[PDB]
Amino acid sequence: GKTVLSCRKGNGSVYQVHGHKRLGPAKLRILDYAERHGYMRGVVKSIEHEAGRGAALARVEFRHPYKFRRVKELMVAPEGMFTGQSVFCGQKAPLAIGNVLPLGQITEGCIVCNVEAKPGDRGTLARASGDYCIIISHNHETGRTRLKLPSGQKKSVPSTSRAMIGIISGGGRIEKPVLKAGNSFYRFRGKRNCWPKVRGVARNPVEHPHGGGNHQHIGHPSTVSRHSPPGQKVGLIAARRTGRIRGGKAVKGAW
Amino acid sequence: AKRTVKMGVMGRYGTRYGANPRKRAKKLEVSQHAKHFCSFCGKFAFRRKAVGIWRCDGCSKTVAGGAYTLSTPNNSTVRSTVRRLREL
Amino acid sequence: RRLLRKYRADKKIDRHVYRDLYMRAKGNVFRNKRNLVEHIHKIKNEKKKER
RNA sequence: CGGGGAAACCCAGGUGGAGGCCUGUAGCGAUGCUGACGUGCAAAUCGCUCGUAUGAUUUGGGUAUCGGAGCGAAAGACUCA
RNA sequence: CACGAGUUGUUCGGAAACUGAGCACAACGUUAUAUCGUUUUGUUAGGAAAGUGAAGGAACUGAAAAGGGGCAACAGAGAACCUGGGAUUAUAUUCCAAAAAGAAAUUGCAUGUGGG
RNA sequence: CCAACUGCAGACCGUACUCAUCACCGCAUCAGGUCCCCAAGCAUAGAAUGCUCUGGUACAUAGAGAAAGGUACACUCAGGGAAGUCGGCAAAAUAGAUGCGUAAGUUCGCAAGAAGCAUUGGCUCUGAGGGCAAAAAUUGCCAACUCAGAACUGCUUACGGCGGGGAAUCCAACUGUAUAAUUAAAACAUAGGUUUGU
RNA sequence: CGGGUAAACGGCGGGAGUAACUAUGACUCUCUUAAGGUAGCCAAAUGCCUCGUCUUCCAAUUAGAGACGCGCAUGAAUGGA
RNA sequence: CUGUACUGAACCAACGGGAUCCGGAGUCUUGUUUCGAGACACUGCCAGAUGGGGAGUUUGGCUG
RNA sequence: GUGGUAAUGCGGCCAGGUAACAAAUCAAUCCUCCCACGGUGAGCUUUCUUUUCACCAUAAUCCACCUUGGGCCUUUUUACUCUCGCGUUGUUCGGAGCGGGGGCUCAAGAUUGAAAAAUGCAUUGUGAGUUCUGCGUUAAAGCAAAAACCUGGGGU
RNA sequence: CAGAGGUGAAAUUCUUAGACCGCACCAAGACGAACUACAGCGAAGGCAUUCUUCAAGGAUACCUUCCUCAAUCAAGAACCAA
Ligand SMILES: [K+]
Ligand SMILES: [K+]
Ligand SMILES: [Mg+2]
Ligand SMILES: [Mg+2]
Ligand SMILES: [Mg+2]
Ligand SMILES: [Mg+2]
Ligand SMILES: [Mg+2]
Ligand SMILES: [Mg+2]
Ligand SMILES: [Mg+2]
Ligand SMILES: [Mg+2]
Ligand SMILES: [Mg+2]
Ligand SMILES: [Mg+2]
Ligand SMILES: [Mg+2]
Ligand SMILES: [Mg+2]
Ligand SMILES: [Mg+2]
Ligand SMILES: [Mg+2]
Ligand SMILES: [Mg+2]
Ligand SMILES: [Mg+2]
Ligand SMILES: [Mg+2]
Ligand SMILES: [Mg+2]
Ligand SMILES: [Mg+2]
Ligand SMILES: [Mg+2]
Ligand SMILES: [Mg+2]
Ligand SMILES: [Mg+2]
Ligand SMILES: [Mg+2]
Ligand SMILES: [Mg+2]
Ligand SMILES: [Mg+2]
Ligand SMILES: [Mg+2]
Ligand SMILES: [Mg+2]
Ligand SMILES: [Mg+2]
Ligand SMILES: [Mg+2]
Ligand SMILES: [Mg+2]
Ligand SMILES: [Mg+2]
Ligand SMILES: [Mg+2]
Ligand SMILES: [Mg+2]
Ligand SMILES: [Mg+2]
Ligand SMILES: [Mg+2]
Ligand SMILES: [Mg+2]
Ligand SMILES: [Mg+2]
Ligand SMILES: [Mg+2]
Ligand SMILES: [Mg+2]
Ligand SMILES: [Mg+2]
Ligand SMILES: [Mg+2]
Ligand SMILES: [Mg+2]
Ligand SMILES: [Mg+2]
Ligand SMILES: [Mg+2]
Ligand SMILES: [Mg+2]
Ligand SMILES: [Mg+2]
Ligand SMILES: [Mg+2]
Ligand code: NA
Ligand code: NA
Ligand code: NA
Ligand code: NA
Ligand code: NA
C-alpha cells in the first residue's frame, strides 16, 4: 500500500492553513492587573471581516496601563458590537453586551461567548459565528462556574475565567444552501486545501482500505476500533452506534 | 411589468439548482441585499458588506450582526435578558 | 432633461410641472422632443383656461 | 412610470445589466473522420470537424510537498520521452 | 570559414536600500552520527544577544529604547532626463563641447547675499 | 541661525545580436512547443473571414509534363433517394438580418432560434429621430448617421461568413474533472442528505 | 458473559390442499428463519430459458417503444422510483 | 480599593521636607513570574493483549 | 509668525496619512483613424477627374491663471404642505440641512507665456475608437505588506 | 433485601451487577388538579398558576359629539381544532 490521504495531511505540506490575508489571532485582553482589580475602558474602532471566518472581528483600542501608547486588540465581535462603542473589561465592569467580566461576576442564566477555559486563556470557548455558552451555576466554595457549551456538554471552569457578554456575531450562516461547487471552492479558498472530497471506495486499494472491487463497496464493516493504527483508522471511528438517529440526539463527545 | 412570477432575484440561476434549494436560498438572499433600519440615525440604510458586517450609508456606523439579516432573534432575546439581569 | 432644464430656467414652467415631467420623462412617457413640447403646451393651455 | 383595485394586490411599458447562461474570436482542450502520415514535418504531428471560452477560467515568474515516497475533482493518473 | 572591429549612463535596469509566499545562519534541543528539528499566529534562544543622541571637564564616557543576524520580486513597493542631431560599418533617453544642439531635474559637501 | 543662489563632485555592474517556419528546447536551419508591449484602410456585429497603403518577403530542390493508382484545408453529376452500411460513417443539407408565429412537458427559470411562414438588390425620392446662438410654439447657421415608407427598375437567386429539424427510450441532475501517447464515459467532482469522533 | 447499534459489513424461504364449467386461489394446513423482499420498478446497461408473450412501428422488425411478470439472479443513502 | 454602570487628552512629575537625597509613588520577603493541577498524571525499563497499518515468505505432486 | 465670520489663505515620544490595492457603467486625456477647409510636393491626364496620394511637427521642465466634476463654508433656511424638491444612462439624496445666492478647497483638463526656432519636414476645426483619469455587482469570495516619505499632538 | 411489574388468568419485561419500595434532592420536557358550574371571554377555531408588562374588545353611565355615515352579498381578502 501507499500512505492514506488522511495520514498525508499530518505532514503539513500543501494542506496547511491559508493565512496570508488573515488579520491575526482574535483574543481577549491579557488578564493584567487592571483587569484583575478594576476595569479597562476601550473603544471599538472597526468591525472587519477576515478570510476563512464566519464571525466578524472588532478592533478595540485601549490605553496602555504603564506607557504612553495605545494598544489595539483584535476580538471576535459579539452580535451588536458597533463602531464607537465603549467596551469595559475587568473585575468591576458592568453587565452589558461586549463587556468582559470574570465568570463569577456574571449572573446565572446570562448568555456569554469568548469564554476562557483557563484564566488568562484570552478566550477559547464559543467563538464560531452564532455560538454562545449559558452560565448554569456558581460554587462560591470551590470558586468554580458550571456552564453549558454549544455542543451541549456541561463544563466547570474556575470562576476567575473571563467571558464576553453576548453571542458571537455572524449567526445563521449555515442556513443558506451553497448550491454550487464554485461556492464551496471560494468558501475553502481562505481556509485550507481540503476540497473537493474523493470517496474512499472510488480510490484504488493501494491508497485506501475502501479501495478496489469490481463494484464500489466497503467489503468490511466501516466501524473501526479506537486502537486502529493510522492508515487503518478510516471510516466510522470507534462508533458507539450507526444508522439514522431516531428520537433524541445524544450529546456527542466523551463522557 | 413583473418580470418573473415566483423566482425573484433567483432568476439569475435559470433552471439549474432545484426549486427548493433556490427558494430557501432566496429568502436569505433577499434579506442580505435589503436595506435595514438603523437604530442610530433612524434611517433604512444598513447594508451588509461581508457576512456579518453591516454598514449604514447614513451615519457610517458599522455593526457586527447576522449572517444574512442585521439582527438575529437570538440576539434580541439575549439583549433583553442582559438588560433584565443588569437591572436585577 | 436638457429641454426641461432650459424650460425651467426661462420660467416657461414652474417647479411642480418640471418635477412631474421629469419623472414622466424618466418613465418613457415622451417619445421625442416634440412630444414633450406638445404635452407642455397642453398643460399651459389648461392652466390658462383655469386661470 | 401608465392602468385597475375598498384593501391585499393585479395588468401593462420602459430603465438596468445578473448568470459556474447561450452563439462566437483569441486562449485553453481534443469528439469524429476509426481522414493524412504511419523507415513521419513529428519517439503522438497535420487537416477538417468538434468541447469550452467571466470562470471550480487561462497564463509568466517566484515559492512549498518526492521514491519502502510525494501529489491526485481518483485514470493506478502524474513525479524531466 | 579567415582577418579586423563593435556594447560609452548622476537620472535607463539591477545593486547600494523595501516587504511577500518562503528560506535557515546563530541559539538551543535531538541524534552513535548534524549532512536533523524549531526558526513571522510580533518574531530566535532558560533568554544577561541594544555599544551609542546627550552631556561634562577632541574623542573618551553614558540615559531610554522588550523580542539576534541575513536572504528571497530585473512584471509587487521604489526610482532625479528628454527632445534634436548631417551622430556609427556596427552603440545610443548612454555619444554631441562653450553658442556643450541644447533645455532640465536631483544628491553630498562647501562659499557668498540676505535675514528677523 | 538657513532659504534662494553659486562652486566642486556625482562611484559599481548590465548595455552587441537574437527571441524563432534558421539564433531557445525537441540529436538538426525539425509543419511540435515557448511569457510581454505597440497594432493601420474597406467590407462587416467584428481581433470572424476576404482583400489592401506602411514595414517585411519571393526562403522552403527544381524543369518537363493529361498513364494507371493515390492524397486533397478540390468540384460536379441524369433517374431514384439510405435500397449502401454493424451503424447515414462520409458527404449533402440548414444558414445573415427583420417581421410574424411557435406544441408536449416544466423545478415556472425555461422548453425556444421549438416547429413554421414571409421579406431583404439597384436607383430616385419622402418622413421621423438634434445642437448652438438672439404662441422664442420663431430667426438664422450647422453636424452625425440610423430607421421607416413610396415610385421606378433588375435577378442567371450569384463573394465571404453563417444552426438542419422533429418523436421517443437508457444513463448521469446541471457547469466542471479525467487515463500526456488507442478509453471523455454512464467514471470522478458537485450542491444536497446521513453517519462517526471530539 | 450481558446490553446497544444496519444512512456498520451485510441479509431479506419452500410444499400441499381449496370458490355452482375450466382455470387461479382471496381461504386453510404445514415445514420453517435473525428476518423471510414492503413501497416501487422490470426480459431494464440487471431475465438463463430467449429472437419470452401481447400490442405498435414496417411489404417484411433477433432492432425500437408500450404492456405483462413463474423476477436463473430487480428493490429501497450497498440508496428505490 | 481616586474612573463607569454611538470614537477627546493623558509620557520625560509638579509640589512638600532634609542636607543632592527623601516622599509624592506605604512597608516586608522562611525567596517560588503568575494562574490551574499535583505526587497523580509525565520520563525510562519490564510485562500482557491487540494489531494487513506495515515487513518477510509460502500457497505440494500425479494429470491424454 | 500671521489673515479670513467660516470653508481656509499667506510667509526623546505619541498619533494619524501617503505608499495601498477585485468589478461593472457612463463620460473620456494623450494618442489612432475619418471628414471639412487651406497651403506644399508628387501621380494620372487617349478621354474625364475644382482630382488621387503624401506632408503640414512642438519633448522634458517651469511661470501666470476658464471649464468639468467632487468635498466643504456662510447665508436664506414655512425646505416636505398632503401631487416636497434636486439630480444620474444607471440601483439616489435632503432639518444628521435639499434647493437658490455668494464663497473656500481638491482633482482632472483649458488658456498665456518661457523652452522654441536657433529645432524638425518638404493646420485649425469636427465625428468615431481609445481606460490615463473622473464618477471616491458574485461573495459562507469582501480582494498583501514594509521601507521611505508626509502632517499633526506634546515639548525645546 | 427478594422479589417487582402486568392480567380475566398469564407471558413478554425489570431484578443480589440490588429491581420494586422509602426520604431529601437534581435535571429535562409537558401540563396547570381539587375550586370547575346548563359559569366567564372570544368572529369562529379556541381560552384556566402567579406577578410585571403591551395593544385591544364588550357592556353600562351620560342633557358629550355627529347627522344617515346603514343592512346584506357574487368578485377579492383575512382567520381557522386535529
Ligand atoms: K493538365
Ligand atoms: K470541376
Ligand atoms: Mg501555518
Ligand atoms: Mg477507478
Ligand atoms: Mg489496503
Ligand atoms: Mg472495496
Ligand atoms: Mg454505487
Ligand atoms: Mg456502494
Ligand atoms: Mg458559459
Ligand atoms: Mg486514422
Ligand atoms: Mg482499475
Ligand atoms: Mg564563425
Ligand atoms: Mg516571512
Ligand atoms: Mg532582497
Ligand atoms: Mg534606475
Ligand atoms: Mg541593443
Ligand atoms: Mg518577439
Ligand atoms: Mg479583421
Ligand atoms: Mg483574424
Ligand atoms: Mg525556408
Ligand atoms: Mg521541403
Ligand atoms: Mg444524382
Ligand atoms: Mg437533378
Ligand atoms: Mg438497410
Ligand atoms: Mg444489404
Ligand atoms: Mg457527419
Ligand atoms: Mg406549453
Ligand atoms: Mg424538444
Ligand atoms: Mg427561424
Ligand atoms: Mg454529467
Ligand atoms: Mg457522476
Ligand atoms: Mg439523473
Ligand atoms: Mg461552461
Ligand atoms: Mg460539459
Ligand atoms: Mg489516451
Ligand atoms: Mg461522481
Ligand atoms: Mg415484490
Ligand atoms: Mg424482469
Ligand atoms: Mg436490454
Ligand atoms: Mg424489443
Ligand atoms: Mg420494454
Ligand atoms: Mg435500509
Ligand atoms: Mg503482505
Ligand atoms: Mg503439476
Ligand atoms: Mg407481581
Ligand atoms: Mg441501590
Ligand atoms: Mg423504576
Ligand atoms: Mg389551578
Ligand atoms: Mg398541529
Ligand atoms: Na482494510
Ligand atoms: Na446567430
Ligand atoms: Na520551427
Ligand atoms: Na504555584
Ligand atoms: Na496486520
PDB file of C-alpha atoms (C1' of nucleotides) in Angstrom, chain G residues 33-60:
ATOM      1  C1'   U G  33     -35.579 -18.176   9.551  1.00  0.00           C
ATOM      2  C1'   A G  34     -32.129 -13.365  12.580  1.00  0.00           C
ATOM      3  C1'   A G  35     -35.810 -11.563   9.347  1.00  0.00           C
ATOM      4  C1'   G G  36     -38.393 -14.197   5.068  1.00  0.00           C
ATOM      5  C1'   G G  37     -38.159  -8.649  -0.337  1.00  0.00           C
ATOM      6  C1'   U G  38     -42.524  -3.907   1.967  1.00  0.00           C
ATOM      7  C1'   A G  39     -43.340   0.796  -1.377  1.00  0.00           C
ATOM      8  C1'   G G  40     -41.802   0.743  -6.105  1.00  0.00           C
ATOM      9  C1'   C G  41     -39.505  -0.999 -10.852  1.00  0.00           C
ATOM     10  C1'   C G  42     -38.502  -4.631 -14.984  1.00  0.00           C
ATOM     11  C1'   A G  43     -36.912  -9.546 -20.398  1.00  0.00           C
ATOM     12  C1'   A G  44     -34.396  -2.706 -17.669  1.00  0.00           C
ATOM     13  C1'   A G  45     -26.818  -1.001 -19.016  1.00  0.00           C
ATOM     14  C1'   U G  46     -29.868  -6.340 -14.024  1.00  0.00           C
ATOM     15  C1'   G G  47     -34.047 -12.444 -17.467  1.00  0.00           C
ATOM     16  C1'   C G  48     -30.522 -18.380 -18.176  1.00  0.00           C
ATOM     17  C1'   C G  49     -34.630 -20.243 -20.865  1.00  0.00           C
ATOM     18  C1'   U G  50     -34.992 -16.065 -25.051  1.00  0.00           C
ATOM     19  C1'   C G  51     -35.375 -13.951 -31.107  1.00  0.00           C
ATOM     20  C1'   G G  52     -40.091 -14.700 -23.811  1.00  0.00           C
ATOM     21  C1'   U G  53     -45.869 -13.428 -24.786  1.00  0.00           C
ATOM     22  C1'   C G  54     -49.352  -9.379 -26.465  1.00  0.00           C
ATOM     23  C1'   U G  55     -49.806  -4.531 -28.912  1.00  0.00           C
ATOM     24  C1'   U G  56     -47.486  -0.904 -32.024  1.00  0.00           C
ATOM     25  C1'   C G  57     -43.809   0.571 -35.503  1.00  0.00           C
ATOM     26  C1'   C G  58     -42.537  -1.950 -41.460  1.00  0.00           C
ATOM     27  C1'   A G  59     -44.279  -5.069 -47.507  1.00  0.00           C
ATOM     28  C1'   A G  60     -41.255  -7.876 -44.244  1.00  0.00           C
TER      29        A G  60
END
